[PDB]
Amino acid sequence: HHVSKGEELFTGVVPILVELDGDVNGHKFSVSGEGEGDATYGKLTLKFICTTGKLPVPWPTLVTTLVQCFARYPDHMKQHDFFKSAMPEGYVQERTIFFKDDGNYKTRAEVKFEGDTLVNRIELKGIDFKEDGNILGHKLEYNLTGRSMDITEERLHYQVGQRALIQAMQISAMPELVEAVQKRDLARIKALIDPMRSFSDATYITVGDASGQRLYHVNPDEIGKSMEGGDSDEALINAASYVSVRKGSLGSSLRGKSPIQDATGKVIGIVSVGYTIEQLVTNHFNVYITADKQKNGIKANFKIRHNIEDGGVQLADHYQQNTPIGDGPVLLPDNHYLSTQSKLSKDPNEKRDHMVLLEFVTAAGITLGMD
Numbered sequence: 001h002h003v004s005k006g007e008e009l010f011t012g013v014v015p016i017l018v019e020l021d022g023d024v025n026g027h028k029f030s031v032s033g034e035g036e037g038d039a040t041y042g043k044l045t046l047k048f049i050c051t052t053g054k055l056p057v058p059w060p061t062l063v064t065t066l067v068q069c070f071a072r073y074p075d076h077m078k079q080h081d082f083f084k085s086a087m088p089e090g091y092v093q094e095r096t097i098f099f100k101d102d103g104n105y106k107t108r109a110e111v112k113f114e115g116d117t118l119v120n121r122i123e124l125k126g127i128d129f130k131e132d133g134n135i136l137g138h139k140l141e142y143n144l145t146g147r148s149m150d151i152t153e154e155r156l157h158y159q160v161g162q163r164a165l166i167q168a169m170q171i172s173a174m175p176e177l178v179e180a181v182q183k184r185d186l187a188r189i190k191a192l193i194d195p196m197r198s199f200s201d202a203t204y205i206t207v208g209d210a211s212g213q214r215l216y217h218v219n220p221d222e223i224g225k226s227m228e229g230g231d232s233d234e235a236l237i238n239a240a241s242y243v244s245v246r247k248g249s250l251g252s253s254l255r256g257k258s259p260i261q262d263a264t265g266k267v268i269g270i271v272s273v274g275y276t277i278e279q280l281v282t283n284h285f286n287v288y289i290t291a292d293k294q295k296n297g298i299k300a301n302f303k304i305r306h307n308i309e310d311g312g313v314q315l316a317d318h319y320q321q322n323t324p325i326g327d328g329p330v331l332l333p334d335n336h337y338l339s340t341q342s343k344l345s346k347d348p349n350e351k352r353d354h355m356v357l358l359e360f361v362t363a364a365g366i367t368l369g370m371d
Contacts, residue, residue, distance in 0.1 A: 007084045010039035010070065010344065015117045016046060018066050024126030025136060027056035033066055035357070037118065039084070040138045041163070042072025044359040049352050057126070059355040060306055064318060065095065065341055066357070067120050068287070071338050073154070073363040080333030080366065082289070082298045082322065089326030091297065100296035100315040103129030112325060133341055134306070134314045141307040144342035146284040156339055156362055157254065160280060161243035163360070164273045165256030167200060169241050171207075172258040172271040180268040181207070181215060181260050185231040186223065187215045201343035201358055203279050204250055206272040207260075215269065222249055225274065233269045235259040245277075252277045287320075287338040288365075296330065297323035336365035 018033020024077045035046030048059075048066055055062075069083035069091075083091065090112025097105035102241040109122035128296075129136050171177060171193070180188040189207055193216050207216035212227045229246030241258040248255070253274040260269030287302045300320035305313040324330045 006079060006087055007081065009087050009113065010084055010087070012040070014036045014070070016044070016067060016120070017074060017114070017117050018048065018120045018122070020062070020066055020122045020124060020254065022124035022126070024057050024124070025129045025131070028052065029056055031066060037067060037070035039070045039072060042070060042361045044070055044357065044361065046348060046357040046359070048355045048357065049350070050354065055353050057135050058138055058306070059104075060140055060142060060344060061135060061142050061316060063144050063344070064097070064304065065105065065109070065122055065124055065243065067111060067118060068338060068361060069111060069118065071361040071363050072159070074370050076360065077336060077363050077366050080331060080336055081363070082331050082333055085331040086324045086326070089324070089328065091322050091324050093322045096319045098317040098319070099135055100317065102133045102135055103127055110325065134308055139309050140314055141309055143307065143344050144304070145307070147282055147305060148284060148286065148340065149281050150286060153339065153364055156364060157280060159362060160275050161254055161256060164202060164254060164275060165243050165258065167202060167273040168256040168258040168271045171196065171205065171273065172260045172269070177207070178260055178262060181209065182262065184209070184215065186215060194302070195348065198345045199343070199356060199358055200273070201255060201341055201360065202273045203276045204274050206274070208232065208270040208272070210236065210268050212270065219249065227270070229255070230337065232257060232270055232272070237269055239265070239267050248274065250276055254280055283341055285340050287340060288335070289333060289337060290335050291332040293332060294320070295321070295323050297321065298333065334366060336363055338362065339364055
């Protein structure tokens with residue numbers, strides 16, 4: 001064998017460490033990140049902790065700064081994966097984030113493998129911020145919800161379906177859920193699904209009994225009523241796991257369904273993990289990537305509109321540059337983009353100022369080429 005380099009280092013789950021040292025208008029802070037990435041699904045699960053106390057800036061403005069080497073590049077685009085090609089020596093990621101009518105971030109980061117762990121060490125410098133503004137004043141919603149009805153991205157819709165079915169099958173197989181469904185323990189079911197729902201980027205998780213009556217729902221007034229859509233019988237009766245598109249109480253949604261079975265294999269319930277069509281076509285950002293031949297790397301210029309609390313949008317104009325750390329050859333890609341979806345949540349057992357991040361990054365924009 002040979003030592004793994006490039007995409008060979010991302011064939012499985014890779015531990016992640018993130019270290020941010022920030023300085024915004026003299027307010028210094030540091031963030032310690034911890035998690036893992038699975039480039040097979042473009043999946044990132046990270047937990048960030050402010051090791052200096054309170055964060056002087058909103059957590060959503062640090063998401064982009066706080067590892068696109070875990071992007072899910074399809075087989076026909078793996079020759080355009082600059083991020084992985086620079087591994088393990090890694091790349092330098094530089095950004096200037098212009099917050100409209102406010103200050104700006106300047107971030108320099110080294111994303112490289114340190115041992116078997118992918119590490120993102122960032123230095124952030126923020127200047128010209130107004131203390132009463134949306135950033136220093138903590139006036140932004142705690143989310144990173146996209147608002148771009150953009151492309152057909154058919155393959156990406158299937159991937160969320162795969163993502164929904166993986167969750168539905170995993171949740172339906174949980175022994176604590178099976179026992180709670182048997183005893184019809186609504187409070188126990190709620191206690192099991194609530195944390196997973198807050199972490200998951202899915203719009204909803206629905207738990208039904210053997211006849212399709214809801215034992216759990218995002219709206220408690222829907223508990224006890226029948227599930228809506230007419231696509232639950234194949235799991236309730238035939239014990240099948242599948243993906244379907246039907247209209248539920250929350251509208252038309254892309255949903256993965258799996259039966260809940262006791263030890264004898266008898267169907268006792270059903271789990272439905274769904275993504276509304278609205279969230280499916282809107283909640284995402286496209287990081288359009290182009291090659292920078294002279295600087296031997298890539299450039300990225302995208303926009304993020306942080307929702308201001310009680311109305312308004314705070315534009316965060318990103319200008320990104322990635323250059324290799326080593327001298328080895330790197331993939332200079334054709335024009336493409338990274339479809340990124342983020343779900344910001346909180347650890348209920350964490351007293352320190354923190355942010356839990358679930359993130360899916362998928363490369364697209366280059367067809368298979370069949371003419």
